[PDB]
Amino acid sequence: LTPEQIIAVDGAHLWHPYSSIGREAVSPVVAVAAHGAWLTLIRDGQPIEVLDAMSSWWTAIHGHGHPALDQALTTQLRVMNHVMFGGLTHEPAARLAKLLVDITPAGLDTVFFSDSGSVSVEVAAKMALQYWRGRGLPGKRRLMTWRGGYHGDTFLAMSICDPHGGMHSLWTDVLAAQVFAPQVPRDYDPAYSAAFEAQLAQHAGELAAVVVEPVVQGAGGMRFHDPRYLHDLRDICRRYEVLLIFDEIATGFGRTGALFAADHAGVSPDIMCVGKALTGGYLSLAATLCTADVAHTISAGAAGALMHGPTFMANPLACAVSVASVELLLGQDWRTRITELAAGLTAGLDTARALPAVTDVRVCGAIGVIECDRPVDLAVATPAALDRGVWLRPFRNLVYAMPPYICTPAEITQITSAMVEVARLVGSL
Amino acid sequence: LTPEQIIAVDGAHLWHPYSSIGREAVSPVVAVAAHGAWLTLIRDGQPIEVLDAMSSWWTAIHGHGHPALDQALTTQLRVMNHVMFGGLTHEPAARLAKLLVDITPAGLDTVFFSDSGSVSVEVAAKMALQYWRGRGLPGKRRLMTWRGGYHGDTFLAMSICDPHGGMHSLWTDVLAAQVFAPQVPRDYDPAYSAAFEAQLAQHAGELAAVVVEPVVQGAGGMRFHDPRYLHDLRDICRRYEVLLIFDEIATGFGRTGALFAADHAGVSPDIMCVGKALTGGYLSLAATLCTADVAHTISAGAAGALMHGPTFMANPLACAVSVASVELLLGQDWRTRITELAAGLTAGLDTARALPAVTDVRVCGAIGVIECDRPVDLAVATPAALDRGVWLRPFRNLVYAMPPYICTPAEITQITSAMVEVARLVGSL
Ligand SMILES: CC(=O)c1ccc(N2CCN(C(=O)c3ccc4c(c3)OCO4)CC2)cc1
Ligand SMILES: CC(=O)c1ccc(N2CCN(C(=O)c3ccc4c(c3)OCO4)CC2)cc1
Ligand SMILES: *Cc1c(COP(=O)(O)O)cnc(C)c1O
Ligand SMILES: *Cc1c(COP(=O)(O)O)cnc(C)c1O
Measuring from atom 6 of ligand 4, which residue has the nearest CA?
B117
Nearest CA to CA, how far is B349 from chain A (Å)?
24
Bridging pattern class, strands B216-217 and B223-224: antiparallel
- Is some CB atom of chain B closer than 8 A to the CB atom of A33? yes
Nearest CA to CA, how far is A308 from chain B (Å)?
5
CA distances from A222 to A45, B88, B402 (A): 34, 22, 47
* B290 bridge partner residues: B110, B271
Is A374 labelled as part of a ligand binding site? no
Nearest CA to CA, how far is A65 from chain B (Å)?
7
Pick from A7, A17, A276: which is nearest to B313 by CB?
A: A17
Mutate to test the pocket of ligand 2, among B82, B85, B115, B308 (most ligand atoms within 8 A of CB): B85
The sign of the torsion formed by the CA atoms of B171, B175, B177, B178 equals: negative
Minimal CA–CA distance to B196: which of B231, B170, B247?
Answer: B231
The sign of the torsion formed by the CA atoms of B378, B380, B385, B387 equals: positive
Q: Judge contact between B25 and B43, C-beta under 8 A.
A: no
CA distances from A276 to A76, A86, A161, B191, B312 (A): 21, 25, 17, 50, 8
Nearest atom (ligand 1) to Cα of B148: 21
Size of interface A-B (CB pairs under 8 A): 403
Residue A84 beta carbon below 6 angstroms from any ligand 4 atom: no
Q: Judge contact between A230 and A265, C-beta under 8 A.
A: yes
Say how far apart CA A201 and CA A196 lie, in whole Å: 9
Say how far apart CA A340 and CA B384 lie, in whole Å: 59
Q: Judge contact between B246 and B287, C-beta under 8 A.
A: no
Say how far apart CA A416 and CA A364 lie, in whole Å: 14
Bridging pattern class, strands A390-391 and A46-52: parallel
**Number of Cβ within a 10 Å radius of residue B277:** 28
Structure's resolution in angstroms:
1.6
* A224 bridge partner residues: A216
Partners of A99 on chain B (C-beta within 8 Å) are none
Measuring from atom 26 of ligand 2, which residue has the nearest CA?
B86
Q: Given an 8 Å threshold on Cβ–Cβ distance, is A283 in contact with B114?
A: no
CA distances from B408 to A37, B341, B351, B403 (A): 47, 9, 20, 10
Q: Give the type of residue at B107.
A: G
Residue A309 alpha carbon to ligand 1 centre in Å: 7
Say how far apart CA B404 and CA B63 lie, in whole Å: 6
Secondary structure of chain B in the HEC alphabet?
CCHHHHHHHHHHHECCCCCCCCCCCCCCEEEEEEEECEEEEEECCEEEEEEECCHHHHCCCCCECCHHHHHHHHHHHCCCCCCCCCCEECHHHHHHHHHHHHHCCCCEEEEEEECCHHHHHHHHHHHHHHHHHCCCCCCCCEEEEECCCCCCCCHHHHHCCCCCCCCHHHHCCCCCCCEEECCCCCCCCHHHHHHHHHHHHHHHHHEEEEEECCCEECCCCCEECCCHHHHHHHHHHHHHCCEEEEECCCCCCCCCCCCCHHHHCCCCCCEEEECCCCCCCCCCCEEEEEEHHHHHHHHHCCCCCCCCCCCCCCCHHHHHHHHHHHHHHHCCCHHHHHHHHHHHHHHHHHHHHHCCCEEEEEECCCCEEEEECCCCCHHHHHHHHHCCCEECCCECCEEEECCCCCCCHHHHHHHHHHHHHHHHHHHHC
CATH class of the region A66-332? alpha beta
Nearest-5° Cα angle at A336, A335 to A337: 90
Instruction: State in Å, rounded, how far the first CA of chain B is from the last one.
Output: 39
**Number of Cβ within a 10 Å radius of residue B137:** 14
* Method used to solve the structure: X-ray
Q: Given an 8 Å threshold on Cβ–Cβ distance, is B303 in contact with A59?
A: no
Say how far apart CA B351 and CA B357 lie, in whole Å: 12
Q: What burial letters (b/e) apply to B220-244, b meaning 16+ CB within 10 Å?
A: bbbbbbbbbbbbbbbebbeeeebbb
Say how far apart CA B164 and CA B180 lie, in whole Å: 12
Nearest-5° Cα angle at A388, A385 to A393: 20
Pick from A94, A284, A318: which is nearest to B14 by CB?
A: A94
**Residue among B1, B4, B5, B14 with most chain A CBs within 10 A, to mutate:** B14
Domain ranges (residues) in chain B: 1-65+333-429, 66-332
Closest chain B residue to A142, measured at CA: B174
Q: Judge contact between B145 and B271, C-beta under 8 A.
A: no
Say how far apart CA B346 and CA B344 lie, in whole Å: 5
* Long-range interactions of B235-240: CB distance < 8 A, separation 24+: B236/B193, B236/B196, B236/B197, B236/B200, B236/B210, B237/B210, B237/B270, B240/B197, B240/B200, B240/B201, B240/B204
Q: Judge contact between B36 and B65, C-beta under 8 A.
A: yes
Which residues neighbour B135 within 8 Å (Cβ) at sequence distance 6 or greater? B297
Minimal CA–CA distance to A310: which of B114, B380, B324?
Answer: B114
Q: Judge contact between A196 and A234, C-beta under 8 A.
A: no
**Number of Cβ within a 10 Å radius of residue B186:** 12
Secondary structure of chain A in the HEC alphabet?
CCHHHHHHHHHHHECCCCCCCCCCCCCCEEEEEEEECEEEEEECCEEEEEEECCHHHHCCCCCECCHHHHHHHHHHHCCCCCCCCCCEECHHHHHHHHHHHHHCCCCEEEEEEECCHHHHHHHHHHHHHHHHHHCCCCCCCEEEEECCCCCCCCHHHHHCCCCCCCCHHHHCCCCCCCEEECCCCCCCCHHHHHHHHHHHHHHHHHEEEEEECCCEECCCCCEECCCHHHHHHHHHHHHHCCEEEEECCCCCCCCCCCCCHHHHCCCCCCEEEECCCCCCCCCCCEEEEEEHHHHHHHHHCCCCCCCCCCCCCCCHHHHHHHHHHHHHHHCCCHHHHHHHHHHHHHHHHHHHHHCCCEEEEEECCCCEEEEECCCCCHHHHHHHHHCCCEECCCECCEEEECCCCCCCHHHHHHHHHHHHHHHHHHCCC
Q: Quick check: is B18 catalytic?
A: yes
- Is some CB atom of chain A closer than 8 A to the CB atom of B337? no
Minimal CA–CA distance to A305: which of A98, A108, A112, A107?
Answer: A112
Helix axes A228-240 and A190-203, enclosed angle (nearest 10): 30
Say how far apart CA B137 and CA B160 lie, in whole Å: 22
Q: Give the type of residue at A159.
A: S
Closest chain B residue to A315, measured at CA: B283
Partners of A393 on chain B (C-beta within 8 Å) are 84, 86-87
Active-site amino acid positions of A: 18, 150, 247, 276
Q: Give the type of residue at B101.
A: V
Largest CA distance in chain B: 64
Residue B268 alpha carbon to ligand 3 centre in Å: 33
Partners of A95 on chain B (C-beta within 8 Å) are 1, 9
Largest CA distance in chain A: 64
Burial of A85: CB neighbours in 10 Å, binned 0-12, 13-18, 19+? buried
Which residues neighbour B132 within 8 Å (Cβ) at sequence distance 6 or greater? B138, B140, B141, B208
**Number of Cβ within a 10 Å radius of residue B90:** 29
Nearest CA to CA, how far is B317 from chain A (Å)?
7
Nearest-5° Cα angle at A185, A183 to A189: 125
Is B118 labelled as part of a ligand binding site? yes
CA dihedral A152, A153, A154, A156 (to 10 degrees): 60
Which residues neighbour A352 within 8 Å (Cβ) at sequence distance 6 or greater? A358, A361, A370, A419, A420, A423
Let me know how long chain B is: 429
CATH class of the region A1-65+333-429? alpha beta
- Is some CB atom of chain A closer than 8 A to the CB atom of B380? no
Say how far apart CA B352 and CA B426 lie, in whole Å: 11
A1-65+333-429 matches A66-332 in fold: no
Q: Give the type of residue at B294.
A: V
Partners of B91 on chain A (C-beta within 8 Å) are 1, 6, 32
Is A404 labelled as part of a ligand binding site? no
* B361 bridge partner residues: B370
Bridging pattern class, strands B46-52 and B390-391: parallel
**Residue among A114, A167, A172, A284 with most chain B CBs within 10 A, to mutate:** A284
CA distances from B288 to A367, B117, B127 (A): 33, 9, 9
